[PDB]
Amino acid sequence: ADAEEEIILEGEDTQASLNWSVIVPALVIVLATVVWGIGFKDSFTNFASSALSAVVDNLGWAFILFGTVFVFFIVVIAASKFGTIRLGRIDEAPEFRTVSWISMMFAAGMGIGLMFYGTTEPLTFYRNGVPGHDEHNVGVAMSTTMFHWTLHPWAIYAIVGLAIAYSTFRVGRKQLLSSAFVPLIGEKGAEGWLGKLIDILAIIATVFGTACSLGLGALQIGAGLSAANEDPSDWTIVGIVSVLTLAFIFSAISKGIQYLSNANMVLAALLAIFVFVVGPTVSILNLLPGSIGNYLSNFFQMAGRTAMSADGTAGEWLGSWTIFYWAWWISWSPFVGMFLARISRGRSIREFILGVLLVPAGVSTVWFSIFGGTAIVFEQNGESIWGDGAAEEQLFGLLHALPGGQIMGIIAMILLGTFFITSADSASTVMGTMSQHGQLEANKWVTAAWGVATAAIGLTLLLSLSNLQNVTIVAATPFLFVVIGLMFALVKDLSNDVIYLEYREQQRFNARLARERRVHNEHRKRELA
Amino acid sequence: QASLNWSVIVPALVIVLATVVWGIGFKDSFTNFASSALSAVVDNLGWAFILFGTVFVFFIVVIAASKFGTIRLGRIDEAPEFRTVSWISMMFAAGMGIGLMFYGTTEPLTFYRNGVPGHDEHNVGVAMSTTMFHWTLHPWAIYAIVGLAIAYSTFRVGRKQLLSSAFVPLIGEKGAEGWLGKLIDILAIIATVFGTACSLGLGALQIGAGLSAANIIEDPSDWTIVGIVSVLTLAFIFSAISGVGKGIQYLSNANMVLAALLAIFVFVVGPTVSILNLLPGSIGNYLSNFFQMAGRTAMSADGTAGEWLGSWTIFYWAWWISWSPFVGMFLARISRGRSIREFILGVLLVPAGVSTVWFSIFGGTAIVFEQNGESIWGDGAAEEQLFGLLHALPGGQIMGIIAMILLGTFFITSADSASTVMGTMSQHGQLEANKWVTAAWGVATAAIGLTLLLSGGDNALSNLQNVTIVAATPFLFVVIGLMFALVKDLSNDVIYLEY
Amino acid sequence: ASLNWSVIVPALVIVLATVVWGIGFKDSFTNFASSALSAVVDNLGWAFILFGTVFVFFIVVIAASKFGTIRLGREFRTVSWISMMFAAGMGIGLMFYGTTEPLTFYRNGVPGHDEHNVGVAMSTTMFHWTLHPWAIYAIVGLAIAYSTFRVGRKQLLSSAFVPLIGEKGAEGWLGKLIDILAIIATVFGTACSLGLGALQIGAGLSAANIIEDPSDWTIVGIVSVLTLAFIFSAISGVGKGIQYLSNANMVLAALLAIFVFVVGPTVSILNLLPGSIGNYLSNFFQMAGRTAMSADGTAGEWLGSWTIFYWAWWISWSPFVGMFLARISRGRSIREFILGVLLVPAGVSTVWFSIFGGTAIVFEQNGESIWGDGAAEEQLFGLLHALPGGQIMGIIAMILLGTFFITSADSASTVMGTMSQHGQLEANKWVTAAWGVATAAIGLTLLLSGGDNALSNLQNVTIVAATPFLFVVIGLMFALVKDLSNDVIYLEYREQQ
Numbered sequence A: 001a002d003a004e005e006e007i008i009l010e011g012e013d014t015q016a017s018l019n020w021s022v023i024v025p026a027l028v029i030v031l032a033t034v035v036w037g038i039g040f041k042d043s044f045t046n047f048a049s050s051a052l053s054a055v056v057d058n059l060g061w062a063f064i065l066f067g068t069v070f071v072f073f074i075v076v077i078a079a080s081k082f083g084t085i086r087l088g089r090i091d092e093a094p095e096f097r098t099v100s101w102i103s104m105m106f107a108a109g110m111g112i113g114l115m116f117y118g119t120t121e122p123l124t125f126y127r128n129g130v131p132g133h134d135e136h137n138v139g140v141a142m143s144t145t146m147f148h149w150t151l152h153p154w155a156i157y158a159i160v161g162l163a164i165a166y167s168t169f170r171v172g173r174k175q176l177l178s179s180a181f182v183p184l185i186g187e188k189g190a191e192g193w194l195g196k197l198i199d200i201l202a203i204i205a206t207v208f209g210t211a212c213s214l215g216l217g218a219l220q221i222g223a224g225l226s227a228a229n230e231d232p233s234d235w236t237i238v239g240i241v242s243v244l245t246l247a248f249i250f251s252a253i254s255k256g257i258q259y260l261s262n263a264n265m266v267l268a269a270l271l272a273i274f275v276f277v278v279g280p281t282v283s284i285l286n287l288l289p290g291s292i293g294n295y296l297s298n299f300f301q302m303a304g305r306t307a308m309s310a311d312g313t314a315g316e317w318l319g320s321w322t323i324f325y326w327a328w329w330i331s332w333s334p335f336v337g338m339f340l341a342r343i344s345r346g347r348s349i350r351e352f353i354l355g356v357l358l359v360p361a362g363v364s365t366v367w368f369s370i371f372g373g374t375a376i377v378f379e380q381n382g383e384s385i386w387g388d389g390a391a392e393e394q395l396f397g398l399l400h401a402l403p404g405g406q407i408m409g410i411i412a413m414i415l416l417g418t419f420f421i422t423s424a425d426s427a428s429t430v431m432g433t434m435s436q437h438g439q440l441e442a443n444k445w446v447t448a449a450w451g452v453a454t455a456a457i458g459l460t461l462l463l464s465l466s467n468l469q470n471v472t473i474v475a476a477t478p479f480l481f482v483v484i485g486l487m488f489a490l491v492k493d494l495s496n497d498v499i500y501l502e503y504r505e506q507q508r509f510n511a512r513l514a515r516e517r518r519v520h521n522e523h524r525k526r527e528l529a
Numbered sequence B: 001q002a003s004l005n006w007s008v009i010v011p012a013l014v015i016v017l018a019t020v021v022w023g024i025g026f027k028d029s030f031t032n033f034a035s036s037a038l039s040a041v042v043d044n045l046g047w048a049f050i051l052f053g054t055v056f057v058f059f060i061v062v063i064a065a066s067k068f069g070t071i072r073l074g075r076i077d078e079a080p081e082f083r084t085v086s087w088i089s090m091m092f093a094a095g096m097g098i099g100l101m102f103y104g105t106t107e108p109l110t111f112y113r114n115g116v117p118g119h120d121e122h123n124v125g126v127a128m129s130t131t132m133f134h135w136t137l138h139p140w141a142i143y144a145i146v147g148l149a150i151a152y153s154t155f156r157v158g159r160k161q162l163l164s165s166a167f168v169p170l171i172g173e174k175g176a177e178g179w180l181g182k183l184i185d186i187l188a189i190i191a192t193v194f195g196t197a198c199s200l201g202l203g204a205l206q207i208g209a210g211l212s213a214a215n216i217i218e219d220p221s222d223w224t225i226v227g228i229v230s231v232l233t234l235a236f237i238f239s240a241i242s243g244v245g246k247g248i249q250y251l252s253n254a255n256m257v258l259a260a261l262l263a264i265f266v267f268v269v270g271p272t273v274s275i276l277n278l279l280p281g282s283i284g285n286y287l288s289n290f291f292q293m294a295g296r297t298a299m300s301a302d303g304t305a306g307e308w309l310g311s312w313t314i315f316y317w318a319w320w321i322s323w324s325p326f327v328g329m330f331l332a333r334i335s336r337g338r339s340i341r342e343f344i345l346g347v348l349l350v351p352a353g354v355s356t357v358w359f360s361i362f363g364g365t366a367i368v369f370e371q372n373g374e375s376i377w378g379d380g381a382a383e384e385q386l387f388g389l390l391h392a393l394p395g396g397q398i399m400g401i402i403a404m405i406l407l408g409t410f411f412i413t414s415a416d417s418a419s420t421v422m423g424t425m426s427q428h429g430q431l432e433a434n435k436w437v438t439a440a441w442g443v444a445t446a447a448i449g450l451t452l453l454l455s456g457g458d459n460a461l462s463n464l465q466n467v468t469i470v471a472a473t474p475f476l477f478v479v480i481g482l483m484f485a486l487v488k489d490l491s492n493d494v495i496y497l498e499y
Numbered sequence C: 001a002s003l004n005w006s007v008i009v010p011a012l013v014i015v016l017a018t019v020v021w022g023i024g025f026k027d028s029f030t031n032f033a034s035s036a037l038s039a040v041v042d043n044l045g046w047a048f049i050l051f052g053t054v055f056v057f058f059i060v061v062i063a064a065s066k067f068g069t070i071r072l073g074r075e076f077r078t079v080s081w082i083s084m085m086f087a088a089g090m091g092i093g094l095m096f097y098g099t100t101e102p103l104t105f106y107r108n109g110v111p112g113h114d115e116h117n118v119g120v121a122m123s124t125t126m127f128h129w130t131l132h133p134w135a136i137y138a139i140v141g142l143a144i145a146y147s148t149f150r151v152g153r154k155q156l157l158s159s160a161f162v163p164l165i166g167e168k169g170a171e172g173w174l175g176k177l178i179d180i181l182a183i184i185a186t187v188f189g190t191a192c193s194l195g196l197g198a199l200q201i202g203a204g205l206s207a208a209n210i211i212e213d214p215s216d217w218t219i220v221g222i223v224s225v226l227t228l229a230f231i232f233s234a235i236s237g238v239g240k241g242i243q244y245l246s247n248a249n250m251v252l253a254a255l256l257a258i259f260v261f262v263v264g265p266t267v268s269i270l271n272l273l274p275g276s277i278g279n280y281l282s283n284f285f286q287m288a289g290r291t292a293m294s295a296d297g298t299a300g301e302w303l304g305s306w307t308i309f310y311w312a313w314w315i316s317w318s319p320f321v322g323m324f325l326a327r328i329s330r331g332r333s334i335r336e337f338i339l340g341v342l343l344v345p346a347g348v349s350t351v352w353f354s355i356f357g358g359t360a361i362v363f364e365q366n367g368e369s370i371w372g373d374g375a376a377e378e379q380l381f382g383l384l385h386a387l388p389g390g391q392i393m394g395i396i397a398m399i400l401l402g403t404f405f406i407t408s409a410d411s412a413s414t415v416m417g418t419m420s421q422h423g424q425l426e427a428n429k430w431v432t433a434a435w436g437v438a439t440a441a442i443g444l445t446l447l448l449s450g451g452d453n454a455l456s457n458l459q460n461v462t463i464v465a466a467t468p469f470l471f472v473v474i475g476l477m478f479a480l481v482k483d484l485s486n487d488v489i490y491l492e493y494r495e496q497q
C-alpha cells in the first residue's frame, strides 16, 4: 500500500502524457481556422456574420440574463457561509503576498482593453449616445462603460476561479476546467468525453479570446505607429504580432510572469498618473462620484437592456458592445480562472472574491475616469479627439494633445504590448496545462506550441475588427454554458464540503438541544401551577 | 345545522344580497355610489394604498432577513409536510389564474401603445417594468403577510384558523370572539367575495367576449354574459357538493396543463426570441424602476396621473388586499413547518417567476406585434385582446377555444378554492368547510360577479374595478394593522426569547 | 477653570479679523469670498460630492454591523433626547429653504432634468435634508461620544482623533488646531444660519404690516434679541433652558405644519409622502453621482449654490451639533445613536417638505403661484397668507423661526465653551454666554457688509470655514474605526473558531 500510495503522488505530478484528444481536436479547429481563413476568405467571413446574427440574435438574452446572474450569484457565495472556507486546506496560508496576489491576477485577466477602449468607449457613448438615452450625457457615458468593465465582467472570473480553485486545492482533483464539473458530471464524466469536450471548448475559447485581444492590440500598436511615427501594408501587423508572439512565449516557459506583470505600474500607472495631473485633473475627480454614483443608479436598467430595449432598436448596439464584451470575457474565463486559482492557494472563498471584483473594479473605475474622462472633456471644449473614428488611433490622439504626448505615445505603445504579453504567457501555460490533464507545470514546448499557434489566429482574424470580434463572440457562445453550469458545480460541491457539513451538523444539533431545553422549561413553568 | 357564527354569515350575506339587490334592483343608483365612492377612495385614500403597498414589501423582506426568519410555522423545530419542490409546484399553480388570462396581454401592450405617466409611449421596458410592479413583489408581499399571519397563529401558537385570532396580540383574547373579531372576519369575508367575484367577472366577460370572437355567439349581449356565469356556477356546485377535493388538485392539474400548454404555444409560434429578451428586460427594468414606481401618485407627472392610477395601480392594490384573505389561507395551509425566511422568499420569488415569463410571453408578443406594423389592439376591449393575439398566430384558432376552457376551469379553481376558504372563516376556523356552505358562498360570490358585470353594462369592468376597490378599502387597514400584530406576536415567540 | 488659551486666542484672531476686514476693507473682503468660494467649489466640490456619500454608507455599515452593539458608556429621558439633539442640529433649515427648495427645483428644474418635475424636485430637496446631512452629524458626534463615554478622554473633538494622532497629538498643535477649526466652523455656521434667519424674520415683518423697512435698527433688534433670548437658555443649560425650549420648538413646529397640512392641499401633501420617499430612493445614487461634470458641464453653478453649499454648511455645523449630540447621548448604544440622528430627523424633514414644498408646488400647479419676486425670505409668508388664517399663523412662523435658531444657538454656545475648557461638559455660564454673544455679533457683520453680500458672505465665508473641517470629519471616519475595533466588548467577540 505504501509503495502504491506515494508512487501515484509523484505519478500525476510528473505526468506529462499530453492528452492526444484534448490537444489535437483543438489544434484542428485552430489550424483549420487559419487555413479556412487564409485559403478561404470569402465564405469564412460569411461564417462570422451569419453565425454572429445567430448567436447574438438567438442567445443574446442568455448573455444578458445570466451575465447579471453571475454577478449576484457570486456576490452571494462571497457574503455566503461558504465564504470562510479556505481554498485548499487549513494547513495552507496565502501562497503569495496579498499585494502581489491581487496584482498578478488583475494584470493577467486584463485584456489590452483598458488601453484600447479606455479612451474610446466613453468618448463614443458620449458622442453617439447609447440606446434609450439622449446624447452628450456624461452620466450614462460613464455608467455604461463602468458597467462593461467593473463587477459584471469580473464576476465571470470569480466564478470559474472559485470553481477551479476549490475543485483543485480543496477537493484535490487535477487542474482541469472539467474536473470543476465533477460534482455534477462525476469522477467518470470529467475523464469521459465531456471532460475533454470542456477542456477543448476551454482551449478553443482561450485561443480566440487571446487572438482577439492580440488583433485589437496589434491594430492599435500599428495605428499607434501610423500616427505617432506608418505601415499601410501588413508588414507590421505580422511584425508586431511576432514581437509579442515571442515575448509572452518567454514567460510561459519561465518567475518571469511574477515579475513582468509586476512592472505594469512603472508603465500603466505612470501613464494614468501623468494624464491625471497634466489634463483636466479636477474634471476627472468629478467623474469618480459621477462614475460610481451613476453606475449604481442605472445598474439594473443596463442588465435589462436587451434587443427589445429602445423600442426594439438596440439589437445591433449590443452586438457591437455589451454582448461582445460578455462573450469576449467568457472566452477568457477558462484560462483566467485556471490562473486565478493557482495564486489563490489558501485564499478564503470570500477574500478571493473581493480581490477579484473590488480591486479590478476600483481600477477600471479610476482608469476610464482619466482617459474616457479627459476625452469627453476635450469633446466639450470643442477640442475633439475623435478623429476618423478609429479607436486604435484615438488612444494616442488624446495623449498627443497633452504636453509631453509623443513620449507617452511610445510608452502607451509598449504598454499596449506588455498589457497583452503579461496576459498571453499565462494563457499559454494554461493552454498546455489542459493539454496535459491538469498538468500544473506543462512542458514548456507544448504551451509555447499554443501561444504561437494562437497568434497564428491573430494573423488570420486581422488580415482576412469585426472578425476579431465576431469570431471571438462565436467561439465563446458554447463556453457560456460552461460558466452557467459551473455555477451549479460550485454549489453542489461546497454543499458537500466537510467543514460546511460539520457546521450544518452542529447546526441541526442545536435546534434539537434548544428545543429540548425550552420544552422541559415549559413543563417546569406549567407544572408550576 | 351547527354553531357556525351567524354574526359573521348574516352580516356577510346581507351585504352581498344588498349589493345583488341594489345592483339589480337599483342598477342606476348603484353605478353612482360606485363612481362616487371610487372617487373618494382614490382621491383621499390613494396615498394610503400607494404608501403602504410598498411598505408591505419592506416589512415582509425585513421579516425574512430578521432573526424571526429562522422560526418555523408550527411547533418548535417542525418540518414541512411536503417537499420544498412540491411546495414550489403548488405556488406555481397559485400564480397562473384569471388575472393573468385577462391582463396578461392587455396590460403590457396598453403601457406600450399609450405609455405610462411620467414616461414616453412605446417604451418596451417601462411597459413591462410597470406590469411586473403590479403582479410580482407588491401583490405577493401582501398575501405573504396574511399567509404568514394565519400560518403562525394556527401552527406556531394554536389559535383557530381565523383572521380575528391573527389579531390576538393587539385585540386581546376576548377580542377575537368579540365585535372586532367578527368584524375583522366579516370584512375578510366580503373582501374575498368581491375579491373573487372580481376574478369571476373578468372570466365571464372574457369568456363572453371570447365566444363572440370565436364566432359562436352573436355578441356579448347582457343575456350572453349571463349564461356563461350560471353554467360555471353549476360547475362550481358539482365540484363542491361531491367533495371540494376535485378543485384543489383535480382541476389544478388540468390548469397546470392548459395554461402551460397555451403559454408554450405563443412562446414557440410567436417571436420566441423577443419573448426571451423580455425576461431580463422585465426583471432588469422592474428593478431599476421599482422605487420610482413606488412613489408614483396623483401628484406624480406634474399632478396628472391620479386617474391612470385608479384604473390600474390603485385598483390592483385593492384587488390584492381583497384576495389576501383567500391566498393567505392557501399559502398558510401548504406551508406548515416551513421557516419564515424560507417561506417569504418562496412566496415572493416563485410566483414572481410565473408572472415574469407569462407577461413576458403574451404582452411581449403583443408589444412585438405593435412594433412591427401588425397590431392586435382591436377596439381596446381588454376582454377580446387575448383572443385577438391568439388568432394572429397559426393554429391560433384552436388555442382560442382552449383559452375559453382554461377560463372555465380557473373560474372554478378560483370560486372553488375560495368557497372553502370562505366557508372556513364562517365556521370558527373549521379546516374542512361544509359541503353546503362553500357551495353556497361560491354561488353567492358568483351572484356578485354577474351583478357587477351586468350592472355596468357596456364595458362594465369599471364597476368590477370600482366596487372591488370600494370593497377592499376597509380591509386595507385590516392588513396594515396585521403588520403590527405579526410583530408583537413574533417578538413573543418562545424561540426569539429562547435566543 | 483654565480655558485652553491656545485653542481660544488663536480662534479669536480669525473672527476678530473677519469683522475688521469685512467692515474696514469691504471690497477686497468679498473679492476673497467670491474667490475662495470658487476655489473650494471648483477644486473640492468633487470631494463634498464623493465623500458626502461615503458618510451615508459608512455610518449605516457601522450601526447595523458589529460595533452597533457597543454602548456609549462604561442621563436624559429618551423622547426629550431626540428633540434635544434634533433641535440642536436643525436650525433655520426647514424655515428658509422649506418652501423655496421644492418650489425652485420644480419651476427651474435641476441639472440634468426637465422642469415642473415633482419627483425630482422632492428627490433633490429630500437629498439635501434627510440622510446625507444627518450622517455628517452622526459621525462627528459618534467619534466624540465614544472617545469620551466609552474610552474616557475629554469631549474635545481633538481627542476623538487620539487613535490616530495619539494621546500626545490631541494635545499637540493639531488637537488644538482641531478644536480651533471646531470653534470657528461652529461660529460661521451659526452666523450664516443667523443671517438667513434674521434676514427671513426681517422680511417676515415687511409683509407682516409691522415693519415695512428692512432697516438695520430692526434686524439688529431681532439679532440681539435672539442672542439674549438664547443666552438665557444656554446659561440655563440643558434641563432648565435648552431641554425646555427644544420641546416648545417642536410644539410650534407641529402647530404650523399641522395648520398648513389641514388648511392647505391635504391629500396632495399626503400623496407626496410616498412620492417624496420613493423618488428619493430612486434618484439617490444619481444624486450622489451628480457632479459639476453632470448635465454636460452645466451642473457646475447649481451645485455651487445648492448641494455643495448645504454639505459645506452642515460641516460647519458638525463641530457643535455632533459634539452636543454626544453629551446628551451617554448610555445610548452605537445603533441607537446612529438611528437617532437619521431616521427621525430624516423622517421629520420629509413630512415637513411634503407639507410646505408640496403646497408651494401645488400652488404653482394651479397657477396660484407663491414665488412672487423670487425672494426666499418671503415665500414662506406668501404661502401662509394664501391659506385662510394664514395671517395669524404667519406670526407663529416668525416666532418659531426665532425658536429654531435659539435651540440651535444655545447648544452651539455651550458646546463652544466645552471646546474652550479642554472638554468641560458644563462650562462656566459666563463662557457659554461669552461665545453665545461673540458669535452673535458676527451675524451683524455679514448682514451689514452689503445687501446681497449677506447671502454672498454668509454662504461663502461659511463654506471656507468648513472647507478644511471637511477633512476633519473624514478623519474621524478613521480614528473612530480603530478606536472601535480596539474595544473590550469587541475584543471579547473576535475570538471565534
Ligand SMILES: OC[C@H]1O[C@H](O[C@H]2[C@H](O)[C@@H](O)[C@H](OCCCCCC3CCCCC3)O[C@@H]2CO)[C@H](O)[C@@H](O)[C@@H]1O
Binding pocket: B025
Ligand atoms: O331595466 C329597466 C328597469 O327600469 C324600468 O323602469 C324605468 C324605465 O326607464 C321605464 O320603464 C320607466 O318609465 C317607462 C314608462 C313605460 C314603462 C312602464 C312603467 C310603468 C310604471 C312602473 C314602471 C314601468 O321608468 C323607469 C326609470 O328608471 C323598469 O322598472 C324595469 O324594466 C327595470 O327595473
Ligand SMILES: [Cl-]
Binding pocket: A137, A138, A139, A140, C112, C293, C294, C295, C296
Ligand atoms: Cl449626468
Ligand SMILES: [Cl-]
Binding pocket: B070, B071, B072, B075, B076, B077, B078, B495
Ligand atoms: Cl423554530
Ligand SMILES: [Cl-]
Binding pocket: A132, A308, A309, A310, A311, B123, B124, B125, B126
Ligand atoms: Cl425599453
Ligand SMILES: [Cl-]
Binding pocket: B118, B299, B300, B301, B302, C117, C118, C119, C120
Ligand atoms: Cl413625477
Ligand code: NA
Binding pocket: C086, C087, C088, C089, C090, C091, C403, C404, C405, C406, C407, C408, C409
Ligand atoms: Na435649533
